[PDB]
Design a protein around this ligand. Sequence first.
Ligand SMILES: Cc1nn(C)c(C)c1C(=O)N1CCN(Cc2nc3ccccc3n2CC(C)(C)C)CC1
Ligand SMILES: [Mg+2]
Ligand SMILES: [Zn+2]
Lengths: 404, 313
Amino acid sequence: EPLYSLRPEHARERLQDDSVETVTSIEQAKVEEKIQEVFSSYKFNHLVPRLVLQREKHFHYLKRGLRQLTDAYECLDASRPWLCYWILHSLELLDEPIPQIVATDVCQFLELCQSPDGGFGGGPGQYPHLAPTYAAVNALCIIGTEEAYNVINREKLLQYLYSLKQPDGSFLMHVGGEVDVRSAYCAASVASLTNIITPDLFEGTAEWIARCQNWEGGIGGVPGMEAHGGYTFCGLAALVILKKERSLNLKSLLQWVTSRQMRFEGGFQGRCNKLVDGCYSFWQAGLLPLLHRALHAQGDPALSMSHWMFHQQALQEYILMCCQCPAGGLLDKPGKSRDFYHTCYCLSGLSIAQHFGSGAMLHDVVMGVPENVLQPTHPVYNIGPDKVIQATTHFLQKPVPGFE
Amino acid sequence: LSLDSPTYVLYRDRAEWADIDPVPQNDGPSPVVQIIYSEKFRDVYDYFRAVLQRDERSERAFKLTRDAIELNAANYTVWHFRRVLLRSLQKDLQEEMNYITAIIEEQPKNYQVWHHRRVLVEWLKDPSQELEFIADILNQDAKNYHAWQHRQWVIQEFRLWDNELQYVDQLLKEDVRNNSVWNQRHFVISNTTGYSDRAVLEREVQYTLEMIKLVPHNESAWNYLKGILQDRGLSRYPNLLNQLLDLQPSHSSPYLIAFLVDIYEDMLENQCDNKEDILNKALELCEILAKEKDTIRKEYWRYIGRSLQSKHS
Ligand SMILES: Cc1nn(C)c(C)c1C(=O)N1CCN(Cc2nc3ccccc3n2CC(C)(C)C)CC1
Ligand SMILES: [Mg+2]
Ligand SMILES: [Zn+2]
């Protein structure tokens, strides 16, 4: 009875298709049948459920990937700073230390990815792009040594961000590339951490992000687009950095994200009427601490003093029972293959689901064995809160760069 | 020579490439996140690195970028150099449209392929194949985010609004739960007639209510009904409350109950009649949702309940 997903009443949360079958209801029922087999597995084998996070299996998978990968990862040859970030962040969540020699090796590799004109590319000699730039800066802040902070050419990073800024407030992902809400988040994230925000760098940016909020309450990649969890995370986190959260309708956004949690599975979907997916445990659940902070800043007296506005217990049960690969690493849903992307965001979402904090109030919910407790993650940057303070404190001792 | 042809040969074994030296990748002396590339991938990328370092704007380099793209379609550096070669060599861009059509069919969720197609369409100033091509991708995955983004881009850029509401109607018949299509409906109406026209709004609310009657547990229709009325305020429409309470006995759902709380919220914020009665009905529905009908959102409904007490008492 302690596990919410296993109670008899939980059977009533299965899909009601109203006797009208479409591709959406058929695929949703297929997933719910597979998820119910996972929930009922303890009853069928006659064992007490024991939700254990397979730390040592995840750790072996991560420390190996940090050094070397098979030709199966050739599709990630232009995302190698992302592999640095996903792996180092999962290791920090699992409280696994980075040896000084390994930390130095990552600093030197990210130096090879850095462009002479600012920003980082997906690998040595590749043109700079805001996505691997965001990942490389977050990876260097997780290391947090003087060597790591010194890798970043702050003068050229600022010049690079200006070369992507558009008159309407948006940013290109790269030169001769395209605009979307992720680029504003990538720029605001790296510029705030490294202390390179000039008075006009983000002029119009908050107003452009606000145009991406649609009729559903969530945010799309560009104006007109369907609300999507990943882009909504990027949109709200960028506005929290710029202190312009009130540019959005926060109540229609709160109602939209809370609706993305699946009543049966416990996990989150990325868009309305789509399937559950482990990575949205971070993109969607990560929005509730950001919304709690935004509403708290307005003096909202109805906020909880112990929990986020999502079912923390049910999200942890979905991740622990349906997203762990037995050989290590985490995944989208049962039947899917493991990868470092889902290992990063399943564990980040699990950490948000365990740790609540607002003002002088702290309250943890650790489902399963007590050893399942992860290290906290900052809801804006998705790196440890300690690493955010250490990086911001380091770079605030340097002036904001001038123009050449 | 196709990359998957049974007679594909490595570039190091090709006579027409014997003059250039392959340039290996520099991963450092103590490498991290190192991909143990297959011989085929490593061979193409060592020769791509050679033509890029010397900026060789030749036909052989153009054919080489096709192989580099097929090995990793997310390598945006290769895509940039391919576009440099398309313009320097004066390549027939309609032949390039045929190529991008084939690779998007193979990798429809890759970002770089869709961006390349938009550049080709902008360069040729020709959107005549786009709606049909996108409808073929949506026929395979009706919720592909890149396909819907490309469709919106083509419609806005070239003013191709005339037949989109009809296409939206077709896909809603196929799957009334496809939220991407309910979004496209709002995209078309808000950019053509708008929702301020009373006849349009009436037609949209009557259509949405008929879809709700047919499939009461489809959330997209409920979200669309709320989205088109929330602008001016749900309390601005007094018949809406009683028309949903009439559908409550036979077509009930936590979506209907949540919509009733949304209506009561706006009635209280706009000085409604029987204010004490309206707040109690709203708090009672918040309790039923938190404890029974929608327990996954218990913290949201408890927040709404406390929020209403704080504001209206
Ligand atoms: C995996 C994978 N497999 N392949 C073949 C590739 C190329 C990759 C890869 O490199 N990825 C996956 C897609 N994301 C897109 C993206 N950029 C972001 C920048 C900042 C924050 C979030 C960002 N998000 C995620 C979403 C917001 C879209 C949810 C970049 C990293
Ligand atoms: Mg690109
Ligand atoms: Zn995922």
